[PDB]
């Protein structure tokens, strides 16, 4: 790896600088380098890893959707050759590579070394997320296996989070948010999506009274995202 010669602490420092500069590809490469040092990640470091790759793949997903839309309309229309498909495939391949890179870090060896609920649920949610992004562009022999890999990762994260975390825990809340979107957008299960979002929201609401002002603000922010989706879906 090109980051093999840089100190772990320097990689983390530069990841934070890249975030300030909105240089998310750099941020991701720095955090990949930090993971490959082989030590477990702190809570702050896990969030840096997640922020970096979320922004990178977020840009690719947005680009893929633009190009897929153009491609779909070309198939309704004058023939303009292979270029739209070719370029959509280029972006798609780059997106799949980023997802594969993240899943590779989780499998070698973040998940197996993660024993606390807060780290294990975090990494399993990430595994579900990046299989979900693969599922968004999948159209082949393994779309179903990709979907089941996302579901399986989310399900394991859910089981742990329900046993080990309070209903207002932001990681638990963000996991349930994303699993409900998986149900609605990927798994063709809108009723499951709605049920999970409601139940998650209501159980968090009943636990808010236990929280500090600052934790209350953290939890209600994510609860509002559940509410926004319920309003869109119903």
């Amino acid at each position: 790896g090109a980051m093999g010669s840089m100190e772990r602490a320097s990689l983390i420092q530069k990841a934070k600088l890249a975030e300030q500069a909105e240089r998310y590809e750099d941020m991701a490469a720095f955090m990949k380098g930090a993971v490959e040092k082989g030590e477990e990640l702190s809570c702050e470091e896990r969030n840096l890893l997640s922020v970096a790759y979320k922004n990178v793949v977020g840009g690719q997903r947005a680009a893929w959707r633009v190009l897929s839309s153009i491609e779909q309309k070309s198939n309704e229309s004058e023939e303009k050759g292979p270029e739209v498909r070719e370029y959509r495939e280029k972006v798609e391949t780059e997106l799949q590579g980023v997802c594969d890179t993240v899943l590779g870090l989780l499998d070698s060896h973040l998940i197996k070394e993660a024993g606390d609920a807060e780290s294990r649920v975090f990494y399993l949610k990430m595994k579900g997320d990046y299989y979900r992004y693969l599922a968004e562009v999948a159209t082949g022999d393994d779309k179903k296996r990709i979907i089941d890999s996302a579901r399986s990762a989310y399900q394991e994260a859910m089981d742990i989070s329900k046993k080990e975390m309070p209903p207002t825990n932001p990681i638990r809340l963000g996991l349930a948010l994303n699993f409900s979107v998986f149900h609605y957008e990927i798994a063709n299960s809108p009723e499951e999506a709605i049920s999970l979002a409601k139940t998650t929201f209501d159980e968090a609401m009943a636990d808010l009274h236990t929280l500090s002002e600052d934790s209350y603000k953290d939890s209600t922010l994510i609860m509002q995202l559940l509410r926004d989706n319920l309003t869109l879906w119903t």
Binding site: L177, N178, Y184, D228, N229, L232
Partner: peptide
């Protein structure tokens, strides 16, 4: 679009 975690 459905919202996912920030």
């Amino acid at each position: 679009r459905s919202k996912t975690s920030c």
